[model samples]
Target chain A: ANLYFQSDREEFQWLVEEFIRVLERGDVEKAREILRLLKEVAEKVNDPLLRLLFRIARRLVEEL
Target chain B: ANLYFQSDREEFQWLVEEFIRVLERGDVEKAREILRLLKEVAEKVNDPLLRLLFRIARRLVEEL
Candidate 1:
């Protein structure tokens, strides 16, 4: 039923919005990859927290 | 030499890409502030990783 994908979509959308906000501030680099990742997440996963965690780790792998 | 800024940009790009990968997987935090700081580093710093590190700190500040 696309249950997992559905939930992931919502969370991913929220993150995209936040990423855009951060970018708009002009104090940060454009999170092109993060946004791209969001797109992919929207297509995959179902668990909300897991989706969010994926996003965080996505950033961390780079940052760390 | 654009040693610092150039280095920062390269590292910044790497992190951004990684951030996207993680976010797409939907695992963890989105790290909005960190992305923002990376942008700032691209605009300000001369050092690569340091600027990237600054971006990391920026994200931490947001959590605090």
Candidate 2:
């Protein structure tokens, strides 16, 4: 893939589904860490959706 | 105030508190409208924190 990060697509889909599941649990502390990881990733990629995601994650970090 | 939008300082504190209260209640449908309002305000102001809040509220709008 042309993306900045690489992984098997199958694994990515599964992993992302798990990520969504974890976030849906209302686990705020753990959620911030996950969001921080995404925010940092977005910082490196400098993409459109990444930028939006980055800001959202950043805001979450500041809030909780 | 000299902000892009002006309001009494005390009024801002109360309204913002109320904003948080509304979002805290998990009323998804009404939330989309309030978030849209914040997103539009962020669009006009072009401020740092506003941008972050904008993306977050926008994300909420899309998600819920």
Candidate 3:
């Protein structure tokens, strides 16, 4: 139970950094790709914090 | 000129991790505090990526 939590957090951090890097360079396409992948992972996680993060990612994608 | 970018990223990452930790433990109040601090920093940053993150943080706070 919640075994995926640690790995999910690590992966989310990595993806978020990558997303910011690409977006800062004006690469909206790559950032969106990262956001989509993040959303997929977020959906698999059963945590409210992750859901909040998913919402944030969705907002970011929408703003792009 | 953009000298704060590196430090800002580091600070943001730290705050994000802290926010997640507190929220995962069902501490929505602490998480919102972190989000407010993050929003303050994002406001000072002149980067669009940071602004996007600010929006995300705002959304997270609203959800909580």
Candidate 4:
């Protein structure tokens, strides 16, 4: 579980950077598409820490 | 550099989750946008470790 958490966390970090990049480029449509996909995957995560992190991201993206 | 490395690593984890979500949703265009942005930011990062992590991610995304 720890290893899974670590790997999942690392993956999330990459995705967030990607999200920022798309947003920075003035690609709202693409950003929304990314957010939607992220939310879908977040819903599937079983671990609490990973799920919570995704939850935070989902809320952040929803607000933006 | 260590602290920055840790934070940057965490951020990348988040981004990876976002990227998978977008890709899983079958939004290749958005995923590409995210990858481009991640690559751009990777180029700007100063820390060697963080830069290397991004380099790995860039290659991973490029291949995908």
Candidate 5:
């Protein structure tokens, strides 16, 4: 179910690190582009139940 | 503006640590109380643009 947030905290951390790695490898421009897309997704989604997912993704993008 | 999510990753981590410290000092009750309030806030707010803000705060609270 989409309602279920399958990825635990550790998995979430990995996603964040992967995002950072992409930027670290001198692909910061690509990273920024990805973040921009995520920002758009965040803008489109409005379900409270999915808030956690959107928030984690947004933070990952906006952090670096 | 509440619309602007300006906190960097380091600042976000600091906030998480502060939240953890409150819980680690054996104040699980107080920590729970704060999280409960935050959850309530999340439930109340329905703005799509603020989804990112709510998502991050909710995850931090839910993770612990």
Candidate 6:
């Protein structure tokens, strides 16, 4: 999945995965914090579509 | 990151990363196709919130 240099595969997904783990553990705060990291993570991706994905994920976690 | 067993870290991220790579490789079709796989991936997650995130990501990809 390294088809792009400095790609979304490398940058965005792990942190998102981490956030979901936090949520599953019932730590909504930690999940939000990881969601915060995803804001920066999305910035690294160079795709607004993926960035939007991050934003929506953050919003969802925020509401939880 | 492994705070939850069988979590998003282990499940969802890799395919999402793959979708992003497909997008970067200039294969919108393939990316959208991966988005299809995500429907099933999201289903595997127990949380409705993360499932919504996956839904939004798929919607974004579909519109692209």
Model 5 CAPRI quality = incorrect
Interface RMSD of each: 10.4, 10.8, 7.6, 12.2, 10.6, 8.9
Off by over 4 Å in 6: A1-8, B1-64
Residue-level lDDT tens digits of model 6 in A40-59: 76776665545656755554
lDDT tens digits by residue: candidate 6, B2-37? 554356534566676677677667687897788767
> Residues B23-47, candidate 1, lDDT per residue (tens digit)?
4555345545346645664665453
Q: Give per-model TM-scores.
A: 0.27, 0.38, 0.46, 0.33, 0.27, 0.46
TM-score of 4: 0.33
| Winner by DockQ | 3
Shift of residue A40 alpha carbon in model 4, Å: 3.2
lDDT of 4 by residue, B6-45 (tens): 5544555556566667865767577666766655554555
lDDT of 5 by residue, A1-64 (tens): 2243443433333344454457557565676665554444335445332333444444434544
lDDT of 3 by residue, B1-64 (tens): 4464466655665666676677667687887788777776666656444555565665545555
Q: lDDT for every model?
A: 0.49, 0.47, 0.63, 0.53, 0.45, 0.63
Q: Report, to 2 decimal places, the DockQ of model 5.
A: 0.07
Residue A25, model 5: lDDT of 74
Better of 2 and 5 by DockQ: 2
DockQ scores for all the models shown? 0.04, 0.08, 0.13, 0.04, 0.07, 0.07
lDDT of model 5 at position B21: 57
Which one wins by TM-score: 1 or 4? 4
| CAPRI level of candidate 2 | incorrect
Question: Between 3 and 5, whose lDDT is larger?
Answer: 3
